[PDB]
Design an enzyme around this catalytic site. Sequence first.
Site, short mmCIF file in Angstrom:
data_model
loop_
_atom_site.label_atom_id
_atom_site.label_comp_id
_atom_site.label_asym_id
_atom_site.label_seq_id
_atom_site.Cartn_x
_atom_site.Cartn_y
_atom_site.Cartn_z
N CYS A 1 0.87 -1.11 0.22
CA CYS A 1 0.10 0.09 -0.04
C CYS A 1 1.00 1.22 -0.09
CB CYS A 1 -1.03 -0.08 1.15
SG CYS A 1 -2.17 1.31 1.36
N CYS B 1 -0.29 4.53 1.48
CA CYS B 1 -0.60 4.72 3.16
C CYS B 1 -0.47 3.40 3.68
CB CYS B 1 -2.12 4.74 3.27
SG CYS B 1 -3.24 3.80 2.32
N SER B 2 -1.16 2.33 3.90
CA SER B 2 -0.81 0.84 4.83
C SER B 2 -1.90 0.14 4.51
CB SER B 2 -0.32 1.45 6.25
OG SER B 2 -1.32 2.22 6.76
N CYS B 3 -2.99 0.26 3.89
CA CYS B 3 -4.19 -0.70 3.45
C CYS B 3 -3.95 -2.09 3.54
CB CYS B 3 -4.68 -0.01 2.32
SG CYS B 3 -5.27 1.63 2.41
FE LIG Z 1 -3.04 1.81 3.15
#
Ligand SMILES: [Fe+3]
Lengths: 212, 198
Positions: free
Chosen positions: B101, B104-106
Amino acid sequence: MDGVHDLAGVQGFGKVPHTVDADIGPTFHAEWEHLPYSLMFAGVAELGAFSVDEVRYVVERMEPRHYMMTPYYERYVIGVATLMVEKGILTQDELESLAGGPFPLSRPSESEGRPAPVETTTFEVGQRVRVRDEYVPGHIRMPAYCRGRVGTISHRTTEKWPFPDAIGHGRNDAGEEPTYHVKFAAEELFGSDTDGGSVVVDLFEGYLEPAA
Amino acid sequence: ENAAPAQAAVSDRAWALFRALDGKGLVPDGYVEGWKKTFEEDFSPRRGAELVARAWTDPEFRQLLLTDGTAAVAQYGYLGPQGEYIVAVEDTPTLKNVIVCSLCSCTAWPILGLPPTWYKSFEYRARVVREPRKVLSEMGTEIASDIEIRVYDTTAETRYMVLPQRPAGTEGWSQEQLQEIVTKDCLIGVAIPQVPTV
Ligand SMILES: [Fe+3]
């Protein structure tokens, strides 16, 4: 928005601090760490003040340097707080007096938003598609490394979701669009400078266009 | 020139946000503590290992994961906030899948768990899309030249999970046993399941 958050492709970073199966330690390395996530859901679900899309955008709206020096969880504490202040729920003064010190928030958006497109071109699995070569100043969910690149579709999503360009600003023009799994050949994205085979990006219908 | 903005101690700022909302009664009693428990105990990669082990043993379920992942996961009631639309990607002898991701960090919270520090680091986000093989080797996973590496970038609402290859050493092992082999990193696509000869 072409901001620092769009890291994919950027060269210069060192190596990833991790060895496979290494001990990552506790889920929260600090007592305050669970707050940013919790307070986010409190605003999205409980208060219905903003959406998750708006949380992403506020973080993206951080001053570039501020973004680079700040750790993950702290980025969300600053974001959620900024939203709270912009929505009129809180006042920066309170935050600062309660913190005992400065509490710099994120920068105000410089883009009203982008409604969902009305040109509904439905693609099927197996079709070659090119990503629209367009520049959006506001929130968007397309990594810079896709513009104008052509890929093949491997999956269309059964469900539909609201356009992030609109809902990420709190617009009602959100609409609903399905997302596609567009498979790009590594060579197409980074040329010869690639150590892999293929990259699969999940793009909203409004970002694509038929390749011909 | 590029001076860092003056800020108060991070904890002081984290609790100032809380205290502000709480003082106005905007946050339900037990809400924050409730979520903490969910993040720590409920969202655990053990749930992902469960799905993989079963998929190795039961071919009927395997097809469910690969065709309608959301259904397969619902069947266990392992659905949640950041994991409402699940798609499982399988590793063949000539294919290795990795998840990232970049923006972000999904990650699929309910099955894999909250994203680890390295998954949300600037270096992983920036490098793995361009140079997967280099990044994996440095981490400890060497992928042969005849194996195509596919990196999935979680941009929209789809949350991925990787279905690793079944290690040849497991001649008739029980689901319970197979579960210990499938570690968190295997689910993210960064590691290859190996038989612990210790
Ligand atoms: Fe994310």
